[PDB]
Amino acid sequence: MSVRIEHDTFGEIEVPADKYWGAQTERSKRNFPVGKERMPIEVVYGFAQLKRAAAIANFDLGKLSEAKKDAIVYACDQILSGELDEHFPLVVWQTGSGTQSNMNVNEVVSYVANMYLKDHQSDESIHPNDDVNKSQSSNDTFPTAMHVALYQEVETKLEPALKLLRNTLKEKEDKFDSIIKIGRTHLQDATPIKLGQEISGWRYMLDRCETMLSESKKHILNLAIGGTAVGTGINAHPEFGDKVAHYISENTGYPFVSSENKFHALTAHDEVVQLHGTLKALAGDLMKIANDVRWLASGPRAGLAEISIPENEPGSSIMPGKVNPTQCEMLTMVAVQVMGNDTVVGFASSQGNFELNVYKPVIMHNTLQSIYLLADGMETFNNNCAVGIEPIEENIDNYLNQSLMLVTALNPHIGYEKAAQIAKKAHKEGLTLKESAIQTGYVTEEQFEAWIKPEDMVDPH
């Protein structure tokens, strides 16, 4: 229960003895006791990449000592290895520049760095602002950390999950290509379609979002670092920003660059708005896919029952055949969350004033959440549902054999009028087209098997 006494302009303040933040973080924590949404640790890691790269760049410019640079890099690598997650207690609902989380990283980095210097018997000392935040400002760091973290989240979470689900749907598309079912438009019976063709629509949806995500994610590589307070770059070396972007690229493997216009970099979030547009496009596609799956799996006796899906929750021995599509429900709830998150991001990006947009935490919070919700949603839906999508061939065959929508294939052989009578007769008398077409005398058994081939009704000719 012990504490450490820190100091600032307002006086003495207790910090928990086992926590590495300083007086700024503790007063900021107390001054914004709002909500339940901690500032995402992913942006903290983005700050650590930035502070790591800044230490090296400042060293290169002869502005930071070797020992200090080594100690800051070490402390930054402590954060990035996930050893210090509990030393970042600030909420999303802080100041709109994200300054307090910037100084939270400055203080923790400095605390761990000074421990390094002492263990190595150094006379030097790290200070949060003069050293860890050197050449930086409260205003160009959080947008840099945000873009670093958002791009990494796309690369490490969203891309592999999109590819996982897409490859499964592609495989189902190829395996079920020979299965002919009855299409539905307006929810009404339509002409035949291969089950694999229907699945191919879901699959190409994911290909389209992948193409579009590659376009929009590229603009997130543009970093604000180097604009300092108002975008002019005052109090920074003319090479500092490019150097930092270079070292973040080195450490992450992603081709970050310093923005061509730092005034845009502080005042705009149109690049994140565009990215979130891709996320909403994917969300809507995933909702449509998930709805098709659960409708196709509906039943067992009063629904469509064209496919089965895996049962992951225990059912009832007295209710055999009931499988709730619970993975579809998760994915569609994720989908509507992304759509609401899209509202926030689009609004917040419009609300900038002069030299800075101060809505950056809420933008980071919503965009990141949309990324990992789509990522985890697709991965889980893939593993726990999509890989287990199987046709129920008996029900699909019955739909094909019982359908009246095949009758148009009789038109080249007996004419529009004779086919119409057959379709009307089958409708009124509850017959199949085969039963009707033979009882009218217009088509024989051999002719009907020769003239009506559903495998010739799912392609242009």
Next chain:
Amino acid sequence: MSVRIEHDTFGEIEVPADKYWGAQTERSKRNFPVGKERMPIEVVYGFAQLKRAAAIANFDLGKLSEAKKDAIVYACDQILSGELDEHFPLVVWQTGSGTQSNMNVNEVVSYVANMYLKDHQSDESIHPNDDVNKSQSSNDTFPTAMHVALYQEVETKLEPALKLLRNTLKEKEDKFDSIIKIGRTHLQDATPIKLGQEISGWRYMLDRCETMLSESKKHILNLAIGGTAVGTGINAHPEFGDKVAHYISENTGYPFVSSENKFHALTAHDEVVQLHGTLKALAGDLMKIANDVRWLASGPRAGLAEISIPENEPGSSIMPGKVNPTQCEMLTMVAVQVMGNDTVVGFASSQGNFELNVYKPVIMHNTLQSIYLLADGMETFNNNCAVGIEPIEENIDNYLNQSLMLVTALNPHIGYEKAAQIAKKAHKEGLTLKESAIQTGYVTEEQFEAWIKPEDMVDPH
């Protein structure tokens, strides 16, 4: 690191030894590893009120023994006293009916209740479904918990915070009523207005939201309990729902009732959409208020600087006068979050099918978050900013004395043309209206003091 082995139809599964949930919660936890948003503990407490009331109602109907009832009630009160929050690990992104969190409560309640029975040397045993979920269904419990939790959140968090901020603005309105400033419309100079009158606009915004919140929160008192699986009430006593609503009311002090139409109660969330409409109304109002405050406090030399706000973060000795309106920024970020949350809720309420809307967790998540973000946001903005709003009379007086918009008060005395000359001359020559009116010879110095009384320009006459 010890574990307890539980079992279901899928086999044996390890539960952490110090955790009170059963095989269903543990399998559900593993099957939905999605996102970072745990199902809100507030809705767990709503479930605890429900399970508590249902134990008493079932006891009244002769369906539950006294010992089982007392043990379930005790277990529910353990949950409601905050002793068991760690035993509810499931995320928002689960089944769309919230079944899994229902069974999480059934298991934890059953676990604690059986401990009670054994500590009292009872031969009876509690079972999660047969006892804790007796007369209930997977489908009518979560909407009941949701409405219980949302209404309580309005009563305990949103209402007191709204009244706190509103009372403060009312006090500033009365204190600054005698302070005459220059209105602005289109951001252009306009006729005088009392500073208290401008604040009265903010205050009445909060009064209006309170009136509208009293109307919309009343519909959240309608509970689904008693409709069971599809709304028909099968497998429940005809009095069960009404008895449960009665006991929840007894235990909470809020006048809950069983819904007049259980089919609506399972399939619709229009009552929550209306409530969230009020929350969005408040959010937009608070954003406007917060923008007025930070614009009035802008400066110290290149802004409007009509007011001072308290400084909570440490400033700079080399930058005196700079106070960032950081509480305004927090409150506007909360405001735009609520607007996005409103998008989710409105969408999700439209997506029901047949006998059940299965978007309930995400609706609960967003609406609850909107309630406590507005509550915490208003409370903190009140304490850390609003109570410290003070006028800067020198700056306000200069705006009034330098304004050309007072010239219209000369019209009844010297005429429109005579006043127009004075206003045009003052604009061209950089004079005050007083200086211009004397150098034209149209008004004396004594007449100008008698004819231009700003305190007569802020009321109808």
Next chain:
Amino acid sequence: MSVRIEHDTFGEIEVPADKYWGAQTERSKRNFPVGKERMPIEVVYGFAQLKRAAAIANFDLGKLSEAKKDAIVYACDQILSGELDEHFPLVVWQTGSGTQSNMNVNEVVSYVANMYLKDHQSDESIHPNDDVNKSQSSNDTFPTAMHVALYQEVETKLEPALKLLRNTLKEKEDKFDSIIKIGRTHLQDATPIKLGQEISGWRYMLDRCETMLSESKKHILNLAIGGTAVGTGINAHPEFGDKVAHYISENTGYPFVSSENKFHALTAHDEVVQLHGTLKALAGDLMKIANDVRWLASGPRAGLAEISIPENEPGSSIMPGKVNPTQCEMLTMVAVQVMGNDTVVGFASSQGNFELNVYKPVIMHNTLQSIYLLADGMETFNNNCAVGIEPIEENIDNYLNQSLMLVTALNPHIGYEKAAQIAKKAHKEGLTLKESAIQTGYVTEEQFEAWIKPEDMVDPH
């Protein structure tokens, strides 16, 4: 091609000879050539009610002669009778205060009024600003016209349409109360439900929205008239605003009042945000209802086919049975429009500054459109679909007789385990519950038709 030459302080400008607006409307029209959305004529009528009432009120205050008042009233009644719709050409995308449409009404009224005075051989002349806009401002008139027009739109369009559709669903609910179908939750087969009971959920949705609409529409009765430029009421008689509200009430039969806080009245649109919350709630309900109808009508052979709906478009004689639910598609398209309109309104209401919110035209445009889209949508969906909803009892009877979800009723008679065997057997062997129950020897043919009463399975007992 004839023109009339008007003039202002910019010079001479041609007005079409057959058009009654003046130089300012002509200049405003040329300065905002934006989009395709004319400022809605309904808000012009709101202005006409306002100018009419203002003329009488000013006459009562001894500020306007009787002949001028009579001529202005006449001109306003010309507008309200729909004789002058072509004299209002300005778009929504004008100034944010609606000033240009205010002066459009001032000029047309003045033009028609001077024709009246000349036709009655009067020597006086009406002026748009000095007479038609007397005691008013650019800023308090448009919000007044907006609230007048929106409330009337609720009364004359939305309320009759909501009652028409609600009464139809109520009638279907009563007629189809004896029809027992199979419920669906998560799209999976569930226990029985009366068709009327399922419809009763749609019906009660509309009752709920009617209750909530009566609450939110009441706040639209609060008018801004009397606040003038900034809310202080300067240049208006202290009784003017209340008198105007009184006479608008007299002429419309709606109980309008002058707002308690004119500063709120100019700067806030939270009352309209709340109203739009009701509209979005109704829109989401209508989407759910419309989706239920088209899914229930899906088929003829590969869907659910529980109901028929009227066919309004000619189909093909070669495709008998295909009826596209085109009215459902119209209603859901209207529904999503209302949800996007809700976004605009909530955003725009947050964006006010100081003494005036200047987003009033776009708020009017979106809110009015939502009202008449829901009104026309409900009316047409009622007339062209809802009234023709009919059950297909053969398909409904088959669902009920083929369902395994009735097996629960066997439990009190033979036990859980025997009933489970019957349900398992019926599932494996493709049997009905009756066929399975008699082949196991557990239930008699007479016992089955005595123990399984679906009419006893749709109520609590």
Next chain:
Amino acid sequence: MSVRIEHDTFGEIEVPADKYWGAQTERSKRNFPVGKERMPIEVVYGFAQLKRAAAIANFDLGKLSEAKKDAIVYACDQILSGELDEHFPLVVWQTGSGTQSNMNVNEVVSYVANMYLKDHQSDESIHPNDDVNKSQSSNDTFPTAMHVALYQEVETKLEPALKLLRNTLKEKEDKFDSIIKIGRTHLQDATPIKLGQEISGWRYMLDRCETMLSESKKHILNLAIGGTAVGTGINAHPEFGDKVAHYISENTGYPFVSSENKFHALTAHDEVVQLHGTLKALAGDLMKIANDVRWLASGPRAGLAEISIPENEPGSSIMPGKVNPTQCEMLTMVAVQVMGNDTVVGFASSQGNFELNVYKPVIMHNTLQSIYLLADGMETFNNNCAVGIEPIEENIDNYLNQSLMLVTALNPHIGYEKAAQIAKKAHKEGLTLKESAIQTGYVTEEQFEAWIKPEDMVDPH
């Protein structure tokens, strides 16, 4: 007042004698009397491009006579030359596939084409379905017309207007580069910034949206034509779709292609969702630009007054200096409209079922409107405001001279402590930091004029 009697399956129906549509359009018009939003004529022109190309392609395949092809092509070019706009009376709120507008084009084209054949003494006759709609379906035509119309609207309206406003802002950026003002962050005074630098942020926002619009508009070039009813291409030649896209490209000059996946092409609108994501990004950017402009223009005496904007509406001679930023208000209202439109589009794209998304009209309506509102908004704001943005140098110079934020440039010379004393003294005693620096004895006036150079404070060094 004369009528022509047409007929269909339901009987005889009157079409106005001067209108060229047939019985199906007249019946569809009566059956959807919903709203006030006519189906945009732009999508009618997209249909005309499609019917033109389809006539040629069908002729190339030997499915259509030369004379029929020439007559259909002629009728289509009559539509595209704007001669027939009044013959398309159907509203947006029709069926969700757009079938009725498809048939509206089929009937008008057929009517005009038969007039051509009879004028050329031809015995052949055009039929709306068998000829004008040959090889097409109700379902793949409207998405083709939508993409054709949307892409053209981007090319002909949005792109030229974006470039106009951007080129203007670039010109102001270059002219005002030598003007040094005071930056604002959080609305608080900050370090200096060139006026041109601040404008460069606006300009680069438009560059960014141009880059992102080039990426997203490309996906709108993928057309559904060839998928026919369900995407399988049945009842169409395997080359038909590609031929149509080729001839639309020939006639428009835009590189349209037939979609790689027709099933996606009918069921998805993620390509339009992404495009509308760009439009919302631009809208948000334009709102920020417009707000900076009206805040910078605020005044004349109680605002910021750093710039002047042109006055387009006549003002009052008794209120000189009053210029309402009315073009800024227009542009921000357009901006929030685009944001609400984005909600509709994102929702509607998620709501497809199986082989067809039937939300296509509402998607077309909102996306087109967003395009032309931004286009007309940018063009008009450019012509009527942006081109006339001029600095008010005396006010900008006074901000720079009066600012305390320049003091940091004294640190390299006198140190942090002595500079802090100067800034503190200047703040307390209402001095310029020049007056304070000389009164402390720390800096000579020759030193101050040499050490403090704002032109060196707006770049890295």
